[PDB]
Amino acid sequence: VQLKPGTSVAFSGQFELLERANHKLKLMVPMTLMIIFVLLYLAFRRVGEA
């Protein structure tokens, strides 16, 4: 299907919310890993064991 100048096509419904949540979850992992590493160094006082 070929597009026409002046008209656009956008998927909506559950897909937009799915993509938003996916991006959020993708960028949310580093914070979790960093908090875990910080609280682990707080307990073992060494980067090796952490």
Added chain:
Amino acid sequence: IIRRSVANRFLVLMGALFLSIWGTWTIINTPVDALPDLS
């Protein structure tokens, strides 16, 4: 307050580095303007 901080200097250095990264991000992501709203 000074002696208890130099002891565990590794955590202090890590915190300083994290603060540097966060501050650089906030700086490059700060809005701009000419004069504050005096109206």
